[PDB]
């Protein structure tokens, strides 16, 4: 049967970038041509593989990561990028093989009173390793005094809200991102394009 790409792209809501969802796709036939021409995409960049060649290739597993960021941060979802999102929220490896797809979701993720449900990790001591997901809410220690789970001076909550409003500039508007990873182990492949 067909691979469930529609469950990821057409999901009625998306996760925050710090708690990005991952869908493991296996043992199915994938129709990439219909998927990539379904909706209109503002960002479509592939790395290490052509999007027309996927219909001919087979992989052990295909990963479909999805999350929401703002417009000025879509450029960070790429191999070799740095920034608050790429370092503390979602990191792709330098030899990432796959495609990153994004589209404007101002109609879906922005509120009149502001949508503060989408968060991103603002404070973290070290950078995330490739494909790392940190959902910790421990109080960040910015000084020499321990915080002991209490917010205060040099003691910050590590998550920060976006606050999406439909009248903001396109750089501040919410964008839903889908990152397709194509893993090729030395094991029998289960996902072939067709």
């Amino acid at each position, epitope marked *: 049967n067909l691979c469930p790409f529609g469950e990821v792209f057409n999901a*009625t*809501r998306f996760a925050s970038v710090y708690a990005w969802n991952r869908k493991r796709i296996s043992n199915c036939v994938a129709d990439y041509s219909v998927l990539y021409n379904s909706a209109s995409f503002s960002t479509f960049k592939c790395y290490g593989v052509s999007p027309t060649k996927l219909n001919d290739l087979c992989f052990t597993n295909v990963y479909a990561d999805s999350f929401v960021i703002r417009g000025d941060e879509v450029r960070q979802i790429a191999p070799g990028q740095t920034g608050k999102i790429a370092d503390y929220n979602y990191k792709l490896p330098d030899d990432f093989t796959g495609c990153v797809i994004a589209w404007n979701s101002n*109609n*879906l993720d922005s*509120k*009149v*009173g502001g*949508n503060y*449900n989408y968060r991103y990790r603002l404070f973290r001591k070290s950078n995330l390793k490739p494909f790392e997901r940190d959902i910790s809410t421990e109080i960040y220690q910015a000084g020499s005094k321990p915080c002991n789970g209490v917010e205060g001076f040099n003691c910050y909550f590590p998550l920060q809200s976006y606050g999406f409003q*439909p009248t903001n500039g396109v750089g501040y508007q919410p964008y839903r991102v889908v990152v397709l990873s194509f893993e090729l182990l030395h094991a029998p492949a289960t996902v072939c394009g067709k």
Partner: antibody
Framework: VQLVESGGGLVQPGRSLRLSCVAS????????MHWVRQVPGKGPEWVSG????????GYADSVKGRFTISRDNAKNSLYLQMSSLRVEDTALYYC??????????????????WGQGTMVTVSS | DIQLTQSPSSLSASVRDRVTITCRAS??????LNWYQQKPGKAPNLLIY???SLQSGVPSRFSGSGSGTDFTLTISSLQPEDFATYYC?????????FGQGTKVDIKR
């Protein structure tokens, strides 16, 4: 896909009732939930709503301070605690699924799936 | 807190006629307005969301338009089964408030 209400019935004014709603056929956690009531022979009145992760809750002014909406995501259930039932609260109470997840200002916020409703009769 | 006023409150039209219902908000609500059709003894069915977007499975003879404070629901060609009360519903701010409704009747 269904929304089934229970808990309604005959109740004396000033008493309390707890309405329940059992959801099936869709991801209950994926959508906001609302209560809308309709007095026999009259129009509709929205009663209360809840985001999903309890991130937002609202009440009609006529019921604020007396009603409490809540949801149990693990049980796919929506609840409405109706302390101090006035006669003006007598109506068929609909359990309704919202289109998305906001209860304030989503252009998509709509009442897409409606339960059959449970009757709450408040009178001496 | 945001008042919705529909005009007319009652309407009489024959089959094949063009029906237009007006809904005015007390303050700007952008495109955050929905239209509902309710037959008596039934739950209200969603017709239009986001002022002008058709609901799935709703016949294309229904269509909505407008933004800000003035909106219109239109039945391009009235049908026998389209007799009902039509409500407009703002989703701009809380509390969620309805219009008083427009009862559409088949003209005799």
């Amino acid at each position: 896909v269904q929304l089934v209400e229970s808990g309604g019935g005959l109740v004396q004014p000033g008493r309390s009732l707890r309405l329940s709603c059992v959801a099936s056929g869709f991801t209950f956690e994926d959508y906001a939930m609302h209560w809308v009531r309709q007095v026999p022979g009259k129009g509709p009145e929205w009663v209360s709503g809840i985001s999903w992760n309890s991130g937002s809750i609202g009440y009609a002014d006529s019921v604020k301070g007396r009603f409490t909406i809540s949801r149990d995501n693990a049980k796919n259930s929506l609840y409405l605690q109706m302390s101090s039932l006035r006669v003006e609260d007598t109506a068929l109470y609909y359990c309704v699924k919202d289109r998305h997840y906001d209860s304030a200002g989503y252009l998509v916020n709509g009442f897409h799936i409606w339960g059959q409703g449970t009757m709450v009769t408040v009178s001496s | 807190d945001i008042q919705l006023t529909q005009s007319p409150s009652s309407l009489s039209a024959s089959v094949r006629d063009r029906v237009t219902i007006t809904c005015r908000a007390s303050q700007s609500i952008d495109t955050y307005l929905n239209w509902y059709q309710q037959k008596p003894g039934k739950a209200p069915n969603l017709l239009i969301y986001a002022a002008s977007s058709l609901q799935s499975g709703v016949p294309s003879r229904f269509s909505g338009s407008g933004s800000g404070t003035d909106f219109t629901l239109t039945i391009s060609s009235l049908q026998p089964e389209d007799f009902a009360t039509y409500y407009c519903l703002q989703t701009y701010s809380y509390p969620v408030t309805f219009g008083q409704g427009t009862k559409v009747d088949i003209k005799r």
